[PDB]
Design a protein around this ligand. Structure first.
Ligand SMILES: Nc1ncnc2c1ncn2[C@@H]1O[C@H](COP(=O)(O)OP(=O)(O)O)[C@@H](O)[C@H]1O
Ligand SMILES: [Ca+2]
Ligand SMILES: [Cl-]
Ligand SMILES: [Mg+2]
Length: 442
């Protein structure tokens, strides 16, 4: 019947155009007055902008809900109570193609892992299409007739997805995020674990209790973790002298020091990609060549510059406590033998997070924390006593204070554990500004 797209934006434009091409009657509604993508819709599509049209939504045979709109909205609740199907664009993609899907979610590392396994598949000779994130709408991936899809899927997208029937699926990790929408970790975990509906194979993280799914006994499962792996699992092996290798069972695969991506969380990301690749048949020799060359993504605990024998790291995309914990632990362990310590810049919009999990790593590895942003007082209350705490009113002042506090073999880390919008346009803006500050140090 009538398909009603609820919420425009990039994915909403993708859904309207896809449904129109396939010969459906499509209407669209959005609360914003003139929504992004107004100029990108075909004329003749009925549009009800300015108000989320409750009457139009109740006229629908099916509603295609933007991931930016909660199913809990009262207008959407009224439709669900009438029995109207509410799905997202990922559901449209699933119906449109039979090709194998590699499905990836998790609180952190989704884009890093999605990019890497996509590169592993491409380098191995697969006609792969990679997307699902903002700006890579999943329906547009059908255009080039790929033989394989690699989808980065958010908890919001998974909430409205059923019977994904992935060739292989993974929840990489979970930590506190997106509770403004999901309410609590219960709702959040349930949303992500929809990625396993009909999954043909499962990869899971041995070291994260919220990764392993409940699936039928016939469903093959393979795990990764940061310990010596069991037979046919992924993990780490240490030589007698301590040298760390990525490994599968008893076989050593590649030294972690031979990767460009650093820190045990990136070792785990690489191992997850090897397991995803094994599930779709990629040869190990090819996967390791891809892995050796992979540089990691911008603003993901990224090396910027060395100034006076102190290395500076941009982790502006560390927008939650779990990401920042990984950054502190990774740099702290890396410099421990040379007796270096971390000077950490923390703060911004804290989103009501529990900052307690940072205390032990700050106490172990940090010589100073410089607090910025609107939730600096709440964060200070949580980390008081763990190490020396300073305040700065601007990012530039924070970088200068960290420079003053550090000596050769220390590192300076911007890993805010917070959203950026109280002082910046985006985490990208915050990271670019950090790089500019570092480049202006003398
Ligand atoms: N396995 C991991 N566990 C925790 N934090 C991680 C992990 N991998 C990367 N991070 C950090 O998480 C943040 C987001 O990384 P990213 O790959 O962009 O994730 P996503 O696409 O899920 O947002 C960055 O601060 C990055 O350094
Ligand atoms: Ca992402
Ligand atoms: Cl942000
Ligand atoms: Mg997220």
């Amino acid at each position: 019947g009538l398909k009603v797209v609820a919420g425009l934006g990039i994915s909403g434009v993708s859904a309207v155009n896809f449904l129109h091409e396939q010969g459906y009657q499509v209407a669209v509604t959005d609360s914003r007055p003139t929504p992004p993508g107004h100029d990108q819709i075909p004329a003749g599509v009925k549009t009800s902008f300015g108000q989320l049209d409750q009457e139009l939504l109740l006229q629908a045979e099916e509603i295609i809900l933007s991931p930016g709109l909660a199913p809990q909205l009262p207008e959407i609740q009224a439709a669900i109570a009438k029995g109207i199907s509410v799905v997202g664009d990922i559901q449209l993609l699933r119906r449109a193609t039979d090709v194998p899907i590699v499905a990836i979610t998790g609180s952190n590392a989704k884009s890093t892992v999605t990019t890497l396994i996509g590169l592993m598949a491409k380098d191995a000779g697969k006609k792969v299409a990679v997307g699902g994130n903002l700006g890579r709408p999943a329906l547009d991936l059908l255009k080039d007739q790929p033989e394989l899809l690699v989808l980065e899927l958010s908890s919001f997208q998974l909430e409205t997805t059923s019977h994904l029937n992935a060739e292989v699926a993974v929840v990489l990790n979970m930590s506190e995020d997106h509770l403004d929408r999901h309410g609590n970790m219960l709702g959040y975990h349930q949303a992500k674990h929809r990625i396993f509906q009909g999954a043909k194979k499962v990869v899971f993280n041995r070291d994260d209790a919220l990764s392993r799914p409940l699936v039928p006994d016939t469903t093959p499962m393979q795990s990764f973790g940061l310990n010596a792996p069991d037979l046919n699992q992924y993990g780490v092996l240490r030589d007698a002298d301590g040298t760390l290798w990525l490994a599968r069972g008893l076989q050593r695969l590649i030294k972690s020091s031979d990767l460009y991506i650093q820190g045990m969380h990136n070792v785990a990301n690489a191992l997850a990609c090897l397991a995803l690749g094994e599930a779709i048949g990629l040869p190990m020799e090819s996967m390791l060549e891809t892995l050796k060359q992979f540089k990691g993504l911008e603003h993901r605990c990224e090396y910027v510059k060395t100034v006076h024998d102190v290395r500076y790291y941009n982790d502006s995309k560390g927008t939650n406590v779990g990401a920042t914990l990984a950054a502190i632990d990774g740099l702290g362990a890396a410099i421990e033998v040379k007796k270096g310590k971390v000077a950490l810049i923390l703060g911004g919009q804290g989103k009501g997070q529990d900052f307690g999990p940072l205390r032990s790593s700050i106490e172990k590895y940090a010589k100073v924390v410089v607090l910025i942003g609107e939730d600096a007082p709440v964060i200070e209350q949580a980390i008081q006593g763990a190490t020396k705490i300073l305040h700065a009113a601007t990012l530039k002042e924070a970088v200068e204070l960290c420079q003053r506090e550090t000596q050769a073999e220390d590192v300076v880390l911007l890993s805010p554990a917070c959203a950026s919008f109280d002082m910046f346009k985006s985490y990208n803006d915050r990271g670019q500004q950090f790089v500019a500050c570092v480049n202006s140090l003398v």
